[PDB]
């Protein structure tokens, strides 16, 4: 488990219907929402990766027990014991498979949320601080285009550092 | 002035299982266990034979109901539930191994045995039990040999099938067990009856077991069948004295086919690789819970209705 | 001023295995492979039957040892090491299939054949090898037919049993194989002995054969037991000349039960779903190492003494 | 693996019989110890879950195909033998893998719950504290016994001490 | 001034599968599936016996081809593709069960039955079909009993073998099935023929049956072989009047051994624990793809040519 | 996954050969490249634990190679054997897929643990650039660098300077 989804993030956003992860922002001009393309694709590709292995297909079997006539009692019992054995094995494997896969899927989605959050933190550098709920409190005015540069990963921290520091400190 | 990170969620999530948690809600999930089948035998791209009320055993000995299934080629052979193997009472020794060889084959040819019989033998006998086109008849592939001159001893007779081909041939014959001492004497004579069958590798002996008293008791007239494989270059000889139901043809099983037992109707427009008593299974899922009895290329049977694979993150609604 | 985070630990940790480490120390763990069983057949809640020194086969033919076990009903049938099938020495065809059919059964009813014999036949043969109430006796469900007039030809005889029930019946008979010419002559006369049995689904002939053999339970002569399933509405006839060991009752297997071979005493106050030679297994663990032979609903057998599942973090001692 | 339990935390604390994870502070009043209930129940809850999966086996009914007390026909005995041994090799390999995989994940899970408590407190402390290499937080203002509990209580308000804290961090 | 962190890479990495990616490049990887194997039978450390053209059944009845194999001790017994069982043609009831019993044993001793016959029996009949020194012979462990005086009724005869030992013995006999009424009459007389065999634990009985068949080693006649185990302290009695091919020795199977069917040549300098039709498999790898039919202690067979287990980090080379 | 390998670190160093993990640095006297022995060994050891588990019953024949098998028991044997083979083959594939998934993420992990070790080490004298580097805000000569690699660096020594630098 990584720290984010069902972690320090309080809940999910039903509203955000265009991606798996993304950004909400607050500035003098208002409020906006946007999805992050790269992080949602990275998660989605890994899911489809799993699905591809799942549907991977096989060996031809022929009948070893007659549907419409009697089999000799003793070899009948052997076949019965053997099939039920094989079936318990696949049953158990099929339970294991989805339990393990599901755990990892969940934790993987968490990790891509974290890696997004981590990327942003490192960009903002000394210009923001974390509020512990997944938001970065930014210490300069940040207009729509400035928000854009953050989600777009072109935000230059040095451009705001001076202002930022004396706002963090006074 | 603030930028917040987060993830999506849905109003209705799906519940899946993990190592640490049953009832774990996620945004989306798909089924790994196929639970629904096609109730028809999809035979597109398959050279198949539906045997109708003809049992595979019937094919080799030529019971009336298999007259249209005495030969053929196929990659798939379909057997139906109450198919007819026999027109006269009796049974086949080692029947399940023979049925599987047939159901494993890719087709059948017939080769004449060449058997001829002397003047003192009647080979053209027939029976009310085996009707063909409203007349007394018999297994197409066999001959009921009796003494032409009733009450008289069946002559010591010899017959030899020679496999002059490059593959093993399957020869069947029958032994007649009369319903009484009276019946036996009339067909074959008072003499002790012995039916001997010998190849390079196979040997066996048969003595007709003579029934008693009324026809409705358990010891009444029957013809039981025996078979063996004759190798290329090898001969098989019948030395008999009365009681032998002789092959006028033997069979040649050819190539491999898939054997299906099912009462599902043939659908020629769909294609499939997996079959069970109930029809076909076409699916990409690796498991199925339709039947533990399948043939072909199949998903593995599991004892579970549903096994959901998560295709999304934990669903955390507000 | 300072604030510090940490986890707990204990003095004595427990080693577990991981994908990366053979010897990995954790805080707690529990066994996943069961190693202990109960030395009892926990039969509470089962209508069970302990055959004691009665062998399943002896139930059908009625050896003295099985007098308490000739009819009954059960979901669980227990077989034992000392178990006797035969008092009069002999053997049975397909004996293990028959034994298995009896051990899956849920009970046995017994139905008279109605067989009567005329004044030429003494139907009350008995022997010292089959003691019953301090007296000489015989299989309870069979009858040793011999010539009433010693040395005379056993008459040609026909007996027919009709199953008028709605389920199949299992009928058993025997063929006597005397140990000397003198014995065969006294019992059946000097004629050639022939016994034939026929139903819709069985036909066979048997010939008593004289032979010197070691004494078993005092006798050098033997009985060969044969059996077959008679279907509802069908008839099975015996045509015999001497040597037939005739059925006076036939059997009916009813429903389903679980067959157990064990050494362990019964405990009708404990419950269990899993059984082996040594008793019962009541565990929640998925695996066991008690025995690779078990019947019922069991953990799977594994070739390992121990397999520890970590129930806590890594242990890092001070 | 997360960097904590066998990592930047030198060693476990035997003294904490109170729970799985927790706090040790040092302030003018004295030193003390407490265990965080959320984090421990998080870990334990996942454990008891693996254990529920382990015992949640409903089972097929097998009957006997091997006689204990009489001999089985030789060829059929050898098929049976080979089948049962081939099944047992599968279950043995499955049981080994199950535990090895499960154990690896159980450790790393416990490591994670620890790292997640640490991060919760690091963020909650904001600019009033700095981390040493070990699992400790050097707090740059006087912290009360009431203040300390306020950090585990998750009620600590960082704006209340910031000015003071910022000044000590720079001077 | 700055310090930077990094991981290595390699120019040429190798592709593996993961749960999420079938084309995942990593720094190093290694095979889990054995592919090579050895086209010889590695028999170093084993007391073995190569049977050559002797079939295991022939050891017990004593076919000529098996003369160097009538007794012995071994832990590995090797059978070859066209080994010979029968000089005088016929077959053995429950032959494959018998063959597996022999092929699981760790050896065989022989034990004389001590059988003897009255004056009117010729017990040393021979045939062109079984040859020693380029001359007529018979199975070494059996005797063809016939009327010394041709066409005469073969005497009613009793022969008892007694197992006075502490382990079970394997006794084999044959039943002669002549090719013609005339031939049967010459050998055994015109009387009806009956052979009955009986112990405490076994009863069966046999009828010589005349019939025309194809020639196998020039004979249309056949011997059907039968066998049973005689327990410690039990006796087995043959009652016969023509047609018995009587055992002159019985066999005792000793201990346990691994049986191999393969025509790969034996190699005495290399050892193995896993064998198939091609010779051997020596590998630490848990999986193999050489053959679904192996004996010994083998890796498990799998339907894949290759499964790479990554042994390094992800490979991220410079752009 | 952890954010480092194939993550916020653009790529690997083909020129590092004495380890899986290590340090590059730039200062007055030039540049350098040293591999980290500790982190390299926690990864490698973990790998050899899997190769260990990898390399750790006697069976006889039940299928005559050279003679005919009775047909019905023959098909039962074929079926059972093909079913065992399907099982082992599925097990083989899952083992490797699952194991490879874990090995990669463990490798990624150990790198992040080293990055995290250094970060807490340097404390308030440095700022991360996001591409895996710490901009050291004071003069730091070759013996200062090894001090960072040795985990012997005392932040308090260079602190007051570095802080005057970060703030102006
Ligand atoms: C297996 O074959 C064995 C050989 O035939 C059977 O053993 C034989 O059984 C008979 C009758 O049950 C015994 O016969 C009697 O002998 C006594 C005298 O016995 C003592 O003297 C003999 C001769 O020197 C000596 O060998 C014994 O050990 C005794 O010291 C007479 O008084 C009787 O009239 C009668 O002739 C045989 O002695 C006995 N043989 C052995 C070696 O025990 C055995 O019964 C067969 N097994 C089965 C299962 O039938
Ligand atoms: C099957 O029978 C035929 C004749 O009954 C045998 O074939 C003869 O074989 C000899 C030598 O092989 C040839 O000289 C003859 O020309 C063959 N006859 C004909 C007309 O082809 C054959 O050998 C028998 N097969 C077996 C296995 O006994
Ligand atoms: C069995 O016998 C009864 C009475 O004779 C008769 O009704 C019935 O037809 C017989 N069964 C068969 C199948 O012949
Ligand atoms: C040890 O494990 C068992 C089962 O996991 C549990 O009942 C018990 O509480 C554990 N004991 C300790 C020391 O926690
Ligand atoms: C079958 O295997 C079991 C297990 O070792 C052994 O007791 C028995 O002797 C073997 N049976 C056969 C058919 O040889
Ligand atoms: C068993 O399978 C093998 C492999 O295809 C094949 O050669 C053989 O015919 C099959 N045996 C039977 C009993 O059909």
Length of chain C in terms of residues written: 318
Residues B10 and B64 occupy one common structural domain: no
Nearest to D117 by CA among D97, D99, D133, D137: D137
CA distance B97 to chain F (A): 5
Q: What residues have CB less than 8 Å from A12, skipping those under 6 apart?
A: A5, B6, B7, B8, B9, B315, B316, B317, B318
Rg of chain B (C-alpha set): 29
E200 lines ligand 1 (CB under 6 A): yes
F78 lines ligand 6 (CB under 6 A): yes
Place of tokens 């260079």: F158
Nearest to D75 by CA among E223, F81, A74, F66: A74
Distance CA F114, CA F118 (A): 6
Ligand nearest to the CA of E233: 1
**Domain residues for F16?**
1-168
Looking at the DSSP bridge assignments, the partners of residue C224 are: C91, C175
Nearest to E220 by CA among E176, E186, E188, E189: E176
Q: What residues have CB less than 8 Å from C137, skipping those under 6 apart?
A: C64, C126, C127, C130, C131
The C-alpha torsion from F96 through F100 and F102 to F105, rounded to 10°, is -170
Nearest to D105 by CA among E18, B20, A93, A110: B20
B45 SS3 class: coil
Which string of b and e fits B39-75 if b means at least 16 CB within 10 Å? ebbbbeebebbbbeebbbbbbbbbbbbbeebbebebe
CA distance readout (Å), F163 to A103, D167, D169, F91: 44, 13, 10, 57
Check B199 against E213: CB less than 8 A apart: yes
CATH of the domain at D100: 3.90.20.10
Residues E124 and E151 occupy one common structural domain: yes
Residue D66 Cα to ligand 5 middle (Å)? 10
- Give the mutation target among B162, B164, B169, B202 for probing the ligand 2 site: most ligand atoms within 8 A of CB: B162
CA distance A14 to chain B (A): 5
Rg of chain A (C-alpha set): 27
Distance CA D15, CA D26 (A): 16
B273 lines ligand 2 (CB under 6 A): no
Residues E316 and E248 occupy one common structural domain: no
- Give the mutation target among E235, E236, E237, E238 for probing the ligand 1 site: most ligand atoms within 8 A of CB: E235
The experimental technique behind this entry is X-ray
Q: Where are the beta strands (DSSP E) in chain A?
A: 21-27, 30-35, 60-61, 128-130, 135-138
8 Å CB contact between B56 and B257: no
Instruction: List alpha helices for chain C, DSSP H.
Output: 56-61, 95-103, 181-188
Of F22, F92, F145, the CB nearest to E32: F92
Half-sphere exposure of E258 (CA within 13 A, CB side): 20
Last residue of a domain, one of C227, C242, C264: C264
Q: What is the DSSP letter of C54?
A: B
**Domain residues for E168?**
47-264
CA distance B84 to chain C (A): 16
Distance CA E240, CA E206 (A): 9
Tokens linked to E130: 């079984």
| Angle at alpha carbon of residue B89, lines to B84 and B94, rounded to 5° | 75
- Residue E104: Cβ within 10 Å count: 18
Count Cβ–Cβ pairs < 8 Å, chain A vs chain F.
Answer: 57
8 Å CB contact between E221 and E177: yes
Please state whether beta strands B287-288 and B300-301 pair in parallel, antiparallel, or not at all (unpaired).
Answer: parallel
Rg of chain E (C-alpha set): 29
Please list every residue in chain E followed by a chain break, i.e. its C lies more than 2.5 Å from the next written N.
none
Q: What residues have CB less than 8 Å from C298, skipping those under 6 apart?
A: C273, C274, C281, C288, D59, D62
Last residue of a domain, one of C219, C244, C264: C264
Q: Is A83 on the interface with E (CB under 8 A)?
A: no
Length of chain A in terms of residues written: 170
Distance CA B13, CA E248 (A): 83
- Name the domain count of chain B: 2
Residues E197 and E125 occupy one common structural domain: yes
Q: What residues have CB less than 8 Å from D146, skipping those under 6 apart?
A: none
The DSSP-derived string for A45-63 is HHHHHHHHHHT----EE--
Half-sphere exposure of B154 (CA within 13 A, CB side): 26
Query: What are B117-124's contacts with CB under 8 Å, separation 24+?
Result: B117/B145, B117/B157, B118/B155, B118/B157, B119/B148, B120/B147, B120/B148, B120/B149, B120/B152, B120/B154, B120/B155, B121/B145, B121/B146, B121/B147, B121/B148, B121/B154, B121/B155, B121/B157, B122/B146, B122/B147, B122/B148, B123/B246
CA distance readout (Å), F118 to A149, F15, F25, F112, F164: 29, 22, 13, 10, 21
Instruction: List alpha helices for C38-169, DSSP H.
Output: 56-61, 95-103
8 Å CB contact between C181 and B71: no
* Ligand 6 atom index nearest CA of F75: 13
Atom 1 (ligand 4) nearest CA: C28
The DSSP-derived string for E231-285 is PTT-EEEEEESS-EEEESEEEEE-SB-EEEE--SPEESS---SEE-SSSB---S-
Atom 6 (ligand 5) nearest CA: D81
Report which secondary-structure segment, H or E, holds E229: strand E222-230
Residue of A nearest to F74 (CA): A64
- Name the domain count of chain D: 1
Distance CA D64, CA D68 (A): 9
Half-sphere exposure of C69 (CA within 13 A, CB side): 29
CATH of the domain at B61: 3.90.209.20
Distance CA B101, CA C190 (A): 48
Tokens linked to E180: 């013609």
For chain E, the first-to-last Cα distance in angstroms comes to: 25
- Pocket around ligand 3: residues whose beta carbon is below 6 Å from it? B 216; C 162, 200, 233-235
Q: What is the DSSP letter of F68?
A: -
CA distance D15 to chain E (A): 37
* Chain A residues near residue F97 by CB distance under 8 angstroms: 53
Residues B87 and B179 occupy one common structural domain: yes
Tokens linked to B44: 């597109």
Burial class (CB in 10 A: 0-12, 13-18, 19+), E318: exposed
Distance CA A167, CA C266 (A): 84
Please state whether beta strands E274-275 and C41-42 pair in parallel, antiparallel, or not at all (unpaired).
Answer: unpaired
Tokens linked to D159: 């704006």
CATH of the domain at B307: 2.10.77.10
Rg of chain C (C-alpha set): 29
Looking at the DSSP bridge assignments, the partners of residue A128 are: A138
Residue C32 Cα to ligand 4 middle (Å)? 14
* Chain F residues near residue C304 by CB distance under 8 angstroms: none
Residue of C nearest to E239 (CA): C211
Distance CA F46, CA C22 (A): 11
Tokens linked to C244: 């037939």
The C-alpha torsion from D132 through D137 and D139 to D145, rounded to 10°, is -150
Percent helix, percent strand, percent coil in chain C, to nearest 5: 10, 40, 50
* Residues 60-99 of chain C whose Cβ lies under 8 A from any Cβ of chain D: 79-81, 83, 96, 99
Looking at the DSSP bridge assignments, the partners of residue F26 are: E2, F31
Pick the residue of A82, A135, A137 with the most D CBs within 10 A to test the interface with D by mutation: A82
Reported resolution, Å:
2.2
Q: Is D101 left (phi over 0), alpha (psi -120 to 50) or beta?
A: alpha
Distance CA F5, CA E27 (A): 12
Distance CA C149, CA C120 (A): 7
8 Å CB contact between E297 and E277: no
Place of tokens 């819970």: B289
- Give the mutation target among B129, B179, B214, B216 for probing the ligand 3 site: most ligand atoms within 8 A of CB: B216
Burial class (CB in 10 A: 0-12, 13-18, 19+), D148: buried
Distance CA D156, CA D121 (A): 10
Nearest to E244 by CA among E161, E128, E134: E161
B180 SS3 class: coil
């Amino acid at each position: 488990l990584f720290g984010a989804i069902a972690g320090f993030l309080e809940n999910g956003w039903e509203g955000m219907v265009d991606g798996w992860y993304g950004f909400r922002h607050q500035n003098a001009q208002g409020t906006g929402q946007a999805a992050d393309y790269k992080s949602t694709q990275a998660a989605i590709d890994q899911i489809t990766g799993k699905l591809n292995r799942l549907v991977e297909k096989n060996t031809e079997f022929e009948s070893i027990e007659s549907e419409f006539s009697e089999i000799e009692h003793q070899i009948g019992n052997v076949i019965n014991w053997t099939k039920d054995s094989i079936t318990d094995i696949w049953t158990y494997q099929a339970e294991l498979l989805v339990a393990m896969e599901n755990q990892h899927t969940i934790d993987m989605a968490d990790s891509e949320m974290l890696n997004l959050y981590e990327r942003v933190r490192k960009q903002l550098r000394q210009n923001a601080e974390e509020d512990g709920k997944g938001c970065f409190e930014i210490y300069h005015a940040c207009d729509d285009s400035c928000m854009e540069s953050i989600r777009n990963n072109t935000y230059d921290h040095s451009q705001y550092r001076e202002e930022a520091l004396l706002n963090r400190l006074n | 002035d603030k930028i917040c990170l987060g993830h999506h969620a849905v109003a209705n999530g799906t519940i899946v299982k993990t190592l640490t948690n049953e009832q774990e809600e996620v945004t989306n999930a798909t089924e790994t266990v196929e639970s629904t089948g096609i109730n028809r035998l999809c035979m597109k791209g398959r050279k198949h034979k539906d045997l109708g009320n003809c049992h595979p055993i019937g094919m080799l000995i030529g019971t009336p109901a298999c007259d249209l299934h005495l030969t053929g080629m196929w990659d798939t052979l379909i057997e139906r539930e109450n198919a007819i193997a026999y027109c006269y009472p009796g049974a086949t020794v080692n029947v399940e191994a023979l049925r599987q060889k047939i159901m494993e084959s890719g087709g059948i040819n017939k080769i004449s045995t060449g058997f001829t019989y002397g003047s003192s033998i009647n080979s053209a006998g027939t029976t009310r039990a085996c009707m063909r086109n409203g007349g007394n008849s018999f297994y197409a592939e066999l001959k009921w040999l009796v003494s032409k001159s009733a009450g008289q001893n069946f002559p010591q007779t010899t017959n030899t099938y020679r496999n002059t081909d490059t593959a093993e041939h399957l020869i069947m014959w029958g032994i007649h067990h009369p319903s009484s001492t009276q019946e036996k004497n009339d067909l074959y004579g008072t003499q002790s009856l012995s039916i001997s069958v010998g190849s390079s590798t196979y040997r066996n002996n048969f003595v007709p077991v003579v029934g008693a008293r009324p026809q409705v008791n358990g010891l009444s007239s029957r013809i039981d069948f025996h078979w063996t494989l004759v190798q290329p270059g090898d001969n098989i000889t019948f030395s008999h004295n009365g009681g032998l139901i002789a092959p006028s043809r033997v069979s040649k099983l050819i190539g491999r086919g898939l054997g299906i037992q099912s009462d599902a109707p043939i659908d020629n427009n769909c294609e499939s690789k997996c079959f069970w008593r109930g029809g076909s299974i076409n699916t990409r899922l690796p498991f199925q819970n339709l039947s533990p009895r399948t043939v072909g290329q199949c998903p593995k049977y599991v004892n579970r209705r549903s096994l959901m694979l998560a295709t999304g993150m934990r669903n955390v609604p507000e």
